[PDB]
PDB file of N, CA and C in Angstrom:
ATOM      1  N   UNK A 245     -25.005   2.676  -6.345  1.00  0.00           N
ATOM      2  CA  UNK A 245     -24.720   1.253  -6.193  1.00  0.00           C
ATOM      3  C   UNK A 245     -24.636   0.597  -7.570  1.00  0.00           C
ATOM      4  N   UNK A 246     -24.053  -0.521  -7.854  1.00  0.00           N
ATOM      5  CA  UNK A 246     -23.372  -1.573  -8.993  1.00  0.00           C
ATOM      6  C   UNK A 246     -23.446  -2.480  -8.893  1.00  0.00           C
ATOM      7  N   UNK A 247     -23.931  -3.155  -9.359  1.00  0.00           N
ATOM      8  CA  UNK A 247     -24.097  -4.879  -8.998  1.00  0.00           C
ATOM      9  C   UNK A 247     -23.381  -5.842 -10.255  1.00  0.00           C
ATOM     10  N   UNK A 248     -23.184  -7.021  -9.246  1.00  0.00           N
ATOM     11  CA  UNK A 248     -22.673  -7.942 -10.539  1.00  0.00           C
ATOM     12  C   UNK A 248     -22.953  -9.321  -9.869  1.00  0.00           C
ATOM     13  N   UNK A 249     -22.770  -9.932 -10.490  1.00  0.00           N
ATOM     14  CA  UNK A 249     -23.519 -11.500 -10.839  1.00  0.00           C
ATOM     15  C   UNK A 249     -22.822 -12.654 -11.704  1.00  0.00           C
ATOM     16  N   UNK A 250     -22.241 -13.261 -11.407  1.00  0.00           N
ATOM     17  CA  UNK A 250     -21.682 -14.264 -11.817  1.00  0.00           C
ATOM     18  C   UNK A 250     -21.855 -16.009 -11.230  1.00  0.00           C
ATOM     19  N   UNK A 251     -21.369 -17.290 -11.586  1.00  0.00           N
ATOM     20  CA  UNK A 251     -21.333 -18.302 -11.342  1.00  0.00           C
ATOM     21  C   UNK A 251     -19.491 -19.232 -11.306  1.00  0.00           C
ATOM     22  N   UNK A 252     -19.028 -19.220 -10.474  1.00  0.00           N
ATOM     23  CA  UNK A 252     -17.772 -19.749 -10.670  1.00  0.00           C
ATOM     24  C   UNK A 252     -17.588 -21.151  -9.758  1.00  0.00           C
ATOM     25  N   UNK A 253     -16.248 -21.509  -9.992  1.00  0.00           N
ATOM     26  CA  UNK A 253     -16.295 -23.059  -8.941  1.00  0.00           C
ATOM     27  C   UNK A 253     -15.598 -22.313  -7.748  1.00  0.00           C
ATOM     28  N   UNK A 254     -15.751 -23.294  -6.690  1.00  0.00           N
ATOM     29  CA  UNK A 254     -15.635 -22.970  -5.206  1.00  0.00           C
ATOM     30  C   UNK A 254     -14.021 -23.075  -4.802  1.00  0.00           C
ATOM     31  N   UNK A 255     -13.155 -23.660  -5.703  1.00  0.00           N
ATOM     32  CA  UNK A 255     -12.088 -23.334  -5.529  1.00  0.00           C
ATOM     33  C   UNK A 255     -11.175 -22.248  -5.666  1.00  0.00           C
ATOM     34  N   UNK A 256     -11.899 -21.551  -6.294  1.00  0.00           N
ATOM     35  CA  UNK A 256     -11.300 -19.778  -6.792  1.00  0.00           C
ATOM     36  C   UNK A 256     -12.100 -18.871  -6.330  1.00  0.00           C
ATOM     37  N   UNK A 257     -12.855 -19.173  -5.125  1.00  0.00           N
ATOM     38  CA  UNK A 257     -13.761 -18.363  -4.670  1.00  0.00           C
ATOM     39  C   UNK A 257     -13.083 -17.113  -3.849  1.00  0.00           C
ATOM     40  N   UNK A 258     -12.089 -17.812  -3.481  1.00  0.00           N
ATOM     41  CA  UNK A 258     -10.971 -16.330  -2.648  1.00  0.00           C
ATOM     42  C   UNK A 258      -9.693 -15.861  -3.859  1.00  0.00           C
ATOM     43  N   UNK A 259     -10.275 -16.435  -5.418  1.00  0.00           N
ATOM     44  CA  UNK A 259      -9.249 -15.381  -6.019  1.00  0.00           C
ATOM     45  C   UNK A 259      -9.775 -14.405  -6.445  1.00  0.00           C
ATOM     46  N   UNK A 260     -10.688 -14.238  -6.420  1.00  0.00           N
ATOM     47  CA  UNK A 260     -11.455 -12.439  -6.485  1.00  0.00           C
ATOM     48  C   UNK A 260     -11.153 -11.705  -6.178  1.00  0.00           C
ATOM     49  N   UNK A 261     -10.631 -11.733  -4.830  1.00  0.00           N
ATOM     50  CA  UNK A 261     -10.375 -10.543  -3.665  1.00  0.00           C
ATOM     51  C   UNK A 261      -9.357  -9.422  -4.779  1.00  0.00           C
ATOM     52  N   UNK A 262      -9.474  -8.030  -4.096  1.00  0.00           N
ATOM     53  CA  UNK A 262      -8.591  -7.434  -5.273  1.00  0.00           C
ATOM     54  C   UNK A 262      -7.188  -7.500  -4.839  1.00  0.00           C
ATOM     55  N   UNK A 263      -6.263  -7.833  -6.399  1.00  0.00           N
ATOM     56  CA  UNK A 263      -4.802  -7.690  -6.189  1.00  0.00           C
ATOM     57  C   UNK A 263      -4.382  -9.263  -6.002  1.00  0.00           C
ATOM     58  N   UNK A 264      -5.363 -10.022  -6.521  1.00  0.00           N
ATOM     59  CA  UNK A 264      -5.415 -11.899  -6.765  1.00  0.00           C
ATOM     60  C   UNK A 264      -4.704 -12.290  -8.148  1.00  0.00           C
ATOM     61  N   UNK A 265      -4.145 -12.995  -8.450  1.00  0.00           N
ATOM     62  CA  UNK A 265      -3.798 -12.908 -10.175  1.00  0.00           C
ATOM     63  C   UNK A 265      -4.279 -14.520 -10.415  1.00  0.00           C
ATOM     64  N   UNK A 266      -4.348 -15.187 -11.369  1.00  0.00           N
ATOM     65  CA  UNK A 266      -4.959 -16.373 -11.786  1.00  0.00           C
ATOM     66  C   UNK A 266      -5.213 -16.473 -12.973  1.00  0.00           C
ATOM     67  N   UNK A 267      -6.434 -16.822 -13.659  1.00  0.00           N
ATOM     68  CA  UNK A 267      -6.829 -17.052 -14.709  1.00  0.00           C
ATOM     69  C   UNK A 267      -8.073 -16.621 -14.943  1.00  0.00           C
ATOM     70  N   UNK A 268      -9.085 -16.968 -13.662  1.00  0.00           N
ATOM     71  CA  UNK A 268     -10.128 -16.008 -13.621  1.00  0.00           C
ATOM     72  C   UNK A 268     -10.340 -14.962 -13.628  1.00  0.00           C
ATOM     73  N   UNK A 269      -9.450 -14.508 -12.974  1.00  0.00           N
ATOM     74  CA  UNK A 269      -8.795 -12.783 -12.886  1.00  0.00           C
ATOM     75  C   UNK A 269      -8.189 -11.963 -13.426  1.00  0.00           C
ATOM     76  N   UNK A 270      -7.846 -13.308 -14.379  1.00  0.00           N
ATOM     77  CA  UNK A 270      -6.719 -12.689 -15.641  1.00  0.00           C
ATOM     78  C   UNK A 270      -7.769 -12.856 -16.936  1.00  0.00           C
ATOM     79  N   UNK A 271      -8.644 -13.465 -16.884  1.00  0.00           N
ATOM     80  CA  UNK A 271      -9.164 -13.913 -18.675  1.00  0.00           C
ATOM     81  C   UNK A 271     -10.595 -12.883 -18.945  1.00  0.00           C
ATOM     82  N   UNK A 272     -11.353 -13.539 -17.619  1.00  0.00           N
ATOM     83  CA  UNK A 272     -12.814 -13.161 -17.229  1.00  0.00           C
ATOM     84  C   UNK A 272     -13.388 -11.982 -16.860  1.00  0.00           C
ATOM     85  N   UNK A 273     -12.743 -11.863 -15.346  1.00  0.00           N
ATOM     86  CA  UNK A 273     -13.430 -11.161 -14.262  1.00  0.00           C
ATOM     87  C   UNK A 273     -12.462 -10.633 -13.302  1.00  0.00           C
ATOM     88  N   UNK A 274     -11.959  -9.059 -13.656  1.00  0.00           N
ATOM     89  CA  UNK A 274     -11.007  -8.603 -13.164  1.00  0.00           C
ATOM     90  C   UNK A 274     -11.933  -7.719 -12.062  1.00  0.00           C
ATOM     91  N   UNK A 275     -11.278  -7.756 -11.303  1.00  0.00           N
ATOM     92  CA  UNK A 275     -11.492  -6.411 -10.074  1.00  0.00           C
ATOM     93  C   UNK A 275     -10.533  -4.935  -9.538  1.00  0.00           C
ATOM     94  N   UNK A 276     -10.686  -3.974  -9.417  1.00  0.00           N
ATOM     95  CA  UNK A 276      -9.968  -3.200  -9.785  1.00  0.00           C
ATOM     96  C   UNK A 276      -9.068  -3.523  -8.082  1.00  0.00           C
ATOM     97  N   UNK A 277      -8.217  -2.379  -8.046  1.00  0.00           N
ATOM     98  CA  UNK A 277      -7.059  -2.649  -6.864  1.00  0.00           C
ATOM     99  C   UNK A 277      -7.552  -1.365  -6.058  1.00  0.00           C
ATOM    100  N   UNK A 278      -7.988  -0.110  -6.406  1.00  0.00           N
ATOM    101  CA  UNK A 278      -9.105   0.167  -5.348  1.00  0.00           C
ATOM    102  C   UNK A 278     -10.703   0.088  -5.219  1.00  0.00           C
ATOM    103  N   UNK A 279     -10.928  -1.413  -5.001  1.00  0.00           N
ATOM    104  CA  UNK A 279     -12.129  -1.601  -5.210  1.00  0.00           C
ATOM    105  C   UNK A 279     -12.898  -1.564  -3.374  1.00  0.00           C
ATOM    106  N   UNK A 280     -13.731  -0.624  -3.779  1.00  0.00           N
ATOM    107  CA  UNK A 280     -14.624  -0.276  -2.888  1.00  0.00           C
ATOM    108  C   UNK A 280     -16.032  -1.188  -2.756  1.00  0.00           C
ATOM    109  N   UNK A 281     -16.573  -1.895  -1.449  1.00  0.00           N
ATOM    110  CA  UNK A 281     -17.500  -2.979  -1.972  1.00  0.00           C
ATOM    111  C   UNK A 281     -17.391  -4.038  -1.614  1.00  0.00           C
ATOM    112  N   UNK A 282     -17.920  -5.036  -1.526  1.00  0.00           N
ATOM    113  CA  UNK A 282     -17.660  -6.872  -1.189  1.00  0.00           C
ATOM    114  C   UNK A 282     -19.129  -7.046  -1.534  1.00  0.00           C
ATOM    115  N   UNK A 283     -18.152  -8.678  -1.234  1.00  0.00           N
ATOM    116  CA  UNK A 283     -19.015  -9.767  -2.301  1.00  0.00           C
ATOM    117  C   UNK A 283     -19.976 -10.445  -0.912  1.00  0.00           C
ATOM    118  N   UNK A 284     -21.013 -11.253  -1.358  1.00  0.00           N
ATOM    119  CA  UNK A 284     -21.443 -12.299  -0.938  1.00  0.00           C
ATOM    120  C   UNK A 284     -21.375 -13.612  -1.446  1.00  0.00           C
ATOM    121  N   UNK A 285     -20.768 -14.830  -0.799  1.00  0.00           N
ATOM    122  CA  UNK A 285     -20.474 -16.161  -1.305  1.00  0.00           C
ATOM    123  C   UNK A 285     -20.989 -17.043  -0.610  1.00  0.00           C
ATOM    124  N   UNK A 286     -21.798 -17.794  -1.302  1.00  0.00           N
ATOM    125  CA  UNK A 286     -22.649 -19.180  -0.856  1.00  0.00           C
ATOM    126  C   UNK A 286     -22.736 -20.183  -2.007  1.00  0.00           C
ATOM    127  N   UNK A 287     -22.127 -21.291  -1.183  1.00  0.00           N
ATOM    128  CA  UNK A 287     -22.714 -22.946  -1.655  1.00  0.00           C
ATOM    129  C   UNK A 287     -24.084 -22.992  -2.414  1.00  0.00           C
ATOM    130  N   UNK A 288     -24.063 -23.552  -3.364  1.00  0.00           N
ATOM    131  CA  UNK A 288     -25.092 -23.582  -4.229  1.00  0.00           C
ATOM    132  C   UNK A 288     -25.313 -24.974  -4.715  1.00  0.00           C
ATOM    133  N   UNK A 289     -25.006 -26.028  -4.373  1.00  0.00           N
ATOM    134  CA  UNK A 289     -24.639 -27.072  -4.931  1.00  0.00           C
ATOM    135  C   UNK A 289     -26.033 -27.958  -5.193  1.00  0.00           C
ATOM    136  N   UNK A 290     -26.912 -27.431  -4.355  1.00  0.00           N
ATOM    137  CA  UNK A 290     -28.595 -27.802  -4.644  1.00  0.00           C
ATOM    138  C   UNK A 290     -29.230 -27.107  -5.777  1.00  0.00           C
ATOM    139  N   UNK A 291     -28.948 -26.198  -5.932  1.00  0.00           N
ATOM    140  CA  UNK A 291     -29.456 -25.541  -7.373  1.00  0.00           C
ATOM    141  C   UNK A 291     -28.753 -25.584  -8.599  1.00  0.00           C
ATOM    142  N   UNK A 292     -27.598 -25.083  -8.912  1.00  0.00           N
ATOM    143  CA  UNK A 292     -26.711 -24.884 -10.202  1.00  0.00           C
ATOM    144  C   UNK A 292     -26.690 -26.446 -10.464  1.00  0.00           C
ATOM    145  N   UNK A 293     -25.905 -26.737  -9.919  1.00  0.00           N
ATOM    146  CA  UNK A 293     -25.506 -28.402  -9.993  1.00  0.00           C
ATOM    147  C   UNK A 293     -26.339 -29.323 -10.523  1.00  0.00           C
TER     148      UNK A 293
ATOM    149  N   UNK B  33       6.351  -5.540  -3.623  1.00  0.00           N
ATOM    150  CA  UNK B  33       5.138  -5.580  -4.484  1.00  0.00           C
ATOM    151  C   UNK B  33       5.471  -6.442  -5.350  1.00  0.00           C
ATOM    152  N   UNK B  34       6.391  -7.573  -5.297  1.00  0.00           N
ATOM    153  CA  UNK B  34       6.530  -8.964  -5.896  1.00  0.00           C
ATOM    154  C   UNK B  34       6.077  -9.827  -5.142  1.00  0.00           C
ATOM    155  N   UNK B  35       6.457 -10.129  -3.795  1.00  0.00           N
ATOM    156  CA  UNK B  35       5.905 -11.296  -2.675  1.00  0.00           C
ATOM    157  C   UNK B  35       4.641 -10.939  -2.525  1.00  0.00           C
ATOM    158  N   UNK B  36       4.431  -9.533  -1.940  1.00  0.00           N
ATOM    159  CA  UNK B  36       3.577  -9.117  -1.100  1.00  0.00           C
ATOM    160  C   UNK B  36       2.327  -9.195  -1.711  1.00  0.00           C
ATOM    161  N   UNK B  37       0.851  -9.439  -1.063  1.00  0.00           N
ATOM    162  CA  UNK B  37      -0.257  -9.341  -1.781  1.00  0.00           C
ATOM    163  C   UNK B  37      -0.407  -7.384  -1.812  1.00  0.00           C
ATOM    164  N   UNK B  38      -1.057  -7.212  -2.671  1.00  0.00           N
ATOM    165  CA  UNK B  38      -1.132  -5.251  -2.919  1.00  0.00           C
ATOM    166  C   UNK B  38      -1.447  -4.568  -1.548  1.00  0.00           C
ATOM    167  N   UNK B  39      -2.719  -5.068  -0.896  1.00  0.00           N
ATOM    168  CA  UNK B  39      -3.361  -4.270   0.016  1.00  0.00           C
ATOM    169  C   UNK B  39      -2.359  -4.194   1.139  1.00  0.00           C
ATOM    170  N   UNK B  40      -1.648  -5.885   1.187  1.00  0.00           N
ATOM    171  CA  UNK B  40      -1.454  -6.013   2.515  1.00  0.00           C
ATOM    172  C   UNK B  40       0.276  -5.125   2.788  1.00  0.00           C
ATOM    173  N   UNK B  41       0.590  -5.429   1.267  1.00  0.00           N
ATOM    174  CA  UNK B  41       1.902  -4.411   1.152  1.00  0.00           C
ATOM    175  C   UNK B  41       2.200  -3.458   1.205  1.00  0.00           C
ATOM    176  N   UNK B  42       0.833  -2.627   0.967  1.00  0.00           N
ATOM    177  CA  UNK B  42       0.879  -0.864   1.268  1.00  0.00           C
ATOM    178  C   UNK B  42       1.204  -0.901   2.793  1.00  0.00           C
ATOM    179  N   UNK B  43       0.665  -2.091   3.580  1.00  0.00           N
ATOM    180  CA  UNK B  43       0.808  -1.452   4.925  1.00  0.00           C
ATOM    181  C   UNK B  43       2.362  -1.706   5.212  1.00  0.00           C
ATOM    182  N   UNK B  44       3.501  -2.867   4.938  1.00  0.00           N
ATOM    183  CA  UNK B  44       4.510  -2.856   5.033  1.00  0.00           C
ATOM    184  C   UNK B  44       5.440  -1.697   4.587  1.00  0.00           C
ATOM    185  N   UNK B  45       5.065  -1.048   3.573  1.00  0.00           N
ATOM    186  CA  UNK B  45       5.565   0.097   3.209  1.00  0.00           C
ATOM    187  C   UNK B  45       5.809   1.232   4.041  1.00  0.00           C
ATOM    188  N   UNK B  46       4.557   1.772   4.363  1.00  0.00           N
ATOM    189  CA  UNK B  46       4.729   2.765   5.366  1.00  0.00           C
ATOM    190  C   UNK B  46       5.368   2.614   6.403  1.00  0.00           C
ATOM    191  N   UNK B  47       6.006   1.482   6.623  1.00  0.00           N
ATOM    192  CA  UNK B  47       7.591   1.924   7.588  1.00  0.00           C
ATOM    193  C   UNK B  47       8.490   2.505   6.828  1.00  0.00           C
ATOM    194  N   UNK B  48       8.683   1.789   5.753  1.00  0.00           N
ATOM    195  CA  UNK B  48       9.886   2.934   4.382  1.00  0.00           C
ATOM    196  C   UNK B  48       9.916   4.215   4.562  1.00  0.00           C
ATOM    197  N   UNK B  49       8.629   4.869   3.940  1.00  0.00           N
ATOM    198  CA  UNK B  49       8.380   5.947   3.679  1.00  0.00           C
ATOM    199  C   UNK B  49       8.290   6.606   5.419  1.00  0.00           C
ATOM    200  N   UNK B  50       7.746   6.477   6.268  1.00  0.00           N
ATOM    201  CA  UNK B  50       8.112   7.218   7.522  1.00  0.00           C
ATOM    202  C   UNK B  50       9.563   7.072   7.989  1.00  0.00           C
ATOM    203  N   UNK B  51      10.017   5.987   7.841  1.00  0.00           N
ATOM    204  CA  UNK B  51      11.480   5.750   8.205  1.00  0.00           C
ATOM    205  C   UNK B  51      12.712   6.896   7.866  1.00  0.00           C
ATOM    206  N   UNK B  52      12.444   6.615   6.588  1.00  0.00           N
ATOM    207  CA  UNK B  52      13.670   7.285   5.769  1.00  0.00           C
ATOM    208  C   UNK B  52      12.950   9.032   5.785  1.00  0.00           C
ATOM    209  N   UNK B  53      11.359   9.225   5.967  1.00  0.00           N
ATOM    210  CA  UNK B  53      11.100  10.659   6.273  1.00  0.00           C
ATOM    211  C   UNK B  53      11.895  10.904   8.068  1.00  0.00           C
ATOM    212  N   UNK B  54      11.455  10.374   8.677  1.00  0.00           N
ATOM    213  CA  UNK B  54      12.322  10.604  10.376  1.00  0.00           C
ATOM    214  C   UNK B  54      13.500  10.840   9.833  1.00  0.00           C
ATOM    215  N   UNK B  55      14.258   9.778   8.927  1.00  0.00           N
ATOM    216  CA  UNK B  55      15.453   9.803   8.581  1.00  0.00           C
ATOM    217  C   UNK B  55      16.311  11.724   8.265  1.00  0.00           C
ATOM    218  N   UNK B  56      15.072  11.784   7.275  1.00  0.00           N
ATOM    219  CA  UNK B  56      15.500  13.416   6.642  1.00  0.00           C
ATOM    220  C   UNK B  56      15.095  14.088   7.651  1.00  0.00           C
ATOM    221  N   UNK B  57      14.264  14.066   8.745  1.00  0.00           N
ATOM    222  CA  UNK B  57      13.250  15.180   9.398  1.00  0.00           C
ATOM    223  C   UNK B  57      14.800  15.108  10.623  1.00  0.00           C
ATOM    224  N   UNK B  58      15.439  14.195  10.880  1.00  0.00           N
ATOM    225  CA  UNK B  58      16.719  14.438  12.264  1.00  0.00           C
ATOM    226  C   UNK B  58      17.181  14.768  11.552  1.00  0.00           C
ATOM    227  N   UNK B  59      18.039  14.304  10.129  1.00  0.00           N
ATOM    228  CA  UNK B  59      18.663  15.278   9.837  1.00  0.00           C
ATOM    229  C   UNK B  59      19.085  16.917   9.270  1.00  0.00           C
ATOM    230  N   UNK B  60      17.455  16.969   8.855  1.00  0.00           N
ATOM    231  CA  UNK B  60      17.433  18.858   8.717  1.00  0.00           C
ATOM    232  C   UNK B  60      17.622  19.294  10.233  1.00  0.00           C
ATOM    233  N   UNK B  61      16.900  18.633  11.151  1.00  0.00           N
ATOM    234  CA  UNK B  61      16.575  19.438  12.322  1.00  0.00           C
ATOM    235  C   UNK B  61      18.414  19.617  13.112  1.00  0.00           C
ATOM    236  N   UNK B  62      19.262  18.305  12.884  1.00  0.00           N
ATOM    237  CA  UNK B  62      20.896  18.908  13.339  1.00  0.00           C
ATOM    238  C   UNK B  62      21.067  19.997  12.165  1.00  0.00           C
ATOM    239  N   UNK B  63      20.985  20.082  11.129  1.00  0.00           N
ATOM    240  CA  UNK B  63      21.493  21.196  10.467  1.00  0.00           C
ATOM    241  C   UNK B  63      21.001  22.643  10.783  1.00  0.00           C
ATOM    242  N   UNK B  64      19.884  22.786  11.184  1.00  0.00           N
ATOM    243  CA  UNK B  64      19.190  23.598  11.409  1.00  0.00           C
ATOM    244  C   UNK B  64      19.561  24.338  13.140  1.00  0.00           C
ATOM    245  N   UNK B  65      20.269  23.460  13.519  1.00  0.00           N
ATOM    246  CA  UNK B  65      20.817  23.922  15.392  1.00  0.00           C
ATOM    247  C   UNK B  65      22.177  24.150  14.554  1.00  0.00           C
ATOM    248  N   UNK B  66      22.720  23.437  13.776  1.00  0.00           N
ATOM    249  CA  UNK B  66      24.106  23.312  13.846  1.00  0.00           C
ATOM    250  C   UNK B  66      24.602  24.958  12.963  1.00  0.00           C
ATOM    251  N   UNK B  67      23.970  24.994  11.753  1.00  0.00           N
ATOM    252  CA  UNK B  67      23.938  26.584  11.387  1.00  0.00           C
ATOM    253  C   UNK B  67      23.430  27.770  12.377  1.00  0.00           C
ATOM    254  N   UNK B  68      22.999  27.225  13.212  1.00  0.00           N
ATOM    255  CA  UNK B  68      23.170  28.200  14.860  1.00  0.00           C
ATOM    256  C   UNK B  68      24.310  28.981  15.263  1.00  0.00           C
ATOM    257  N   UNK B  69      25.118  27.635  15.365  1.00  0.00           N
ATOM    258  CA  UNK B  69      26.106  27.680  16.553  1.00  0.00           C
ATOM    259  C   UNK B  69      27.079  28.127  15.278  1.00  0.00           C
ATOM    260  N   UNK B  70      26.934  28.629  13.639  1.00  0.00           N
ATOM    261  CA  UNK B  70      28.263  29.110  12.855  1.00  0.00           C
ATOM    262  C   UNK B  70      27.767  30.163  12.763  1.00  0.00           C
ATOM    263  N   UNK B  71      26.279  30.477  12.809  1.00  0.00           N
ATOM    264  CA  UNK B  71      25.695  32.140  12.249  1.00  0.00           C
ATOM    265  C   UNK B  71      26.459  33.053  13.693  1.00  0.00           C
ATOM    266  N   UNK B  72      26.518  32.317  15.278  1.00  0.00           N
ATOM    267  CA  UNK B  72      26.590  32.840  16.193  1.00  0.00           C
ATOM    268  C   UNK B  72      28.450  33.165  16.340  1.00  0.00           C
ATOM    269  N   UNK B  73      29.223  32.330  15.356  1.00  0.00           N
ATOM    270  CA  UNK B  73      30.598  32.476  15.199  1.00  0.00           C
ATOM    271  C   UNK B  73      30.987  33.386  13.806  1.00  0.00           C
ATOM    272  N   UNK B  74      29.740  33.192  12.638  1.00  0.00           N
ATOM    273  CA  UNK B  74      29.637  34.434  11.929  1.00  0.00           C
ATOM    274  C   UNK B  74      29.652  35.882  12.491  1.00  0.00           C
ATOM    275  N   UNK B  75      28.658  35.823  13.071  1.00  0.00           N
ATOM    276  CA  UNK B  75      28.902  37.441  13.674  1.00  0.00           C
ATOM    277  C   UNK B  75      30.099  37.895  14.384  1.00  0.00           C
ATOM    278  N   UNK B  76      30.571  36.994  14.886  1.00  0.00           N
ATOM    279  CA  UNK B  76      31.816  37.241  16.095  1.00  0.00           C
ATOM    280  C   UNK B  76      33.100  37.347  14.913  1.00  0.00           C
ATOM    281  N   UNK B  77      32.626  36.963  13.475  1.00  0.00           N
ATOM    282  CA  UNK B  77      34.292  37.131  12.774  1.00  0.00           C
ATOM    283  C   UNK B  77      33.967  38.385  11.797  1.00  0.00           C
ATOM    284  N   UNK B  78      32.455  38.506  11.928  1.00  0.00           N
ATOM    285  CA  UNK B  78      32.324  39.783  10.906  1.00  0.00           C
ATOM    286  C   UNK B  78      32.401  40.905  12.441  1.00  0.00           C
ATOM    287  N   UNK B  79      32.185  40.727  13.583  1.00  0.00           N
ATOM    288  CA  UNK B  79      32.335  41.553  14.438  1.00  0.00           C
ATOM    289  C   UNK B  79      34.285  42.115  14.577  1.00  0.00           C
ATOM    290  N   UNK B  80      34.638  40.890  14.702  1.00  0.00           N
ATOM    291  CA  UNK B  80      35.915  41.155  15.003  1.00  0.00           C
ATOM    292  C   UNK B  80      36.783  41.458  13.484  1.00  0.00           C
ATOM    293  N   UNK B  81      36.737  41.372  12.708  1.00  0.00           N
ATOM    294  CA  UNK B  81      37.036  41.905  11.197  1.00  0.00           C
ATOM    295  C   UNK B  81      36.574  43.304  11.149  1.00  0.00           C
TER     296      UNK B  81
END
């Protein structure tokens, strides 16, 4: 197992998925195109914020 | 693999690739009856020669 950990805004939360192109995906935080695995995504807006 | 998102395009594909394989697989299989019916007119001209 591999873990990863990041903080992003909630509008690019479905450009992760693999085979997404953007800026996040393009600059940051690429994902490969056979990526084996998923994410978990939750609202955080009581803590980070 | 310009429109299409990656994952979801592999699956559009595999009509291509089975298509145009059916495509080749009928046509070996007439060639394969059809050199029958000349091997069976071969013999009859090397018979009669």
């Amino acid at each position: 197992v591999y873990a990863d950990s990041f903080v992003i805004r909630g509008d690019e939360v479905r450009q992760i998925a693999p085979g997404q192109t953007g800026n996040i995906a393009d600059y940051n935080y690429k994902l490969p195109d056979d990526f084996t695995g998923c994410v978990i995504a939750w609202n955080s807006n009581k803590l980070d914020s | 693999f310009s429109r299409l998102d990656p994952p979801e395009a592999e699956v559009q594909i595999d009509r291509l690739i089975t298509g145009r394989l059916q495509s080749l697989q009928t046509y070996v299989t007439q060639q394969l009856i059809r050199a029958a019916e000349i091997r069976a007119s071969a013999n009859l001209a090397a018979t009669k020669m």
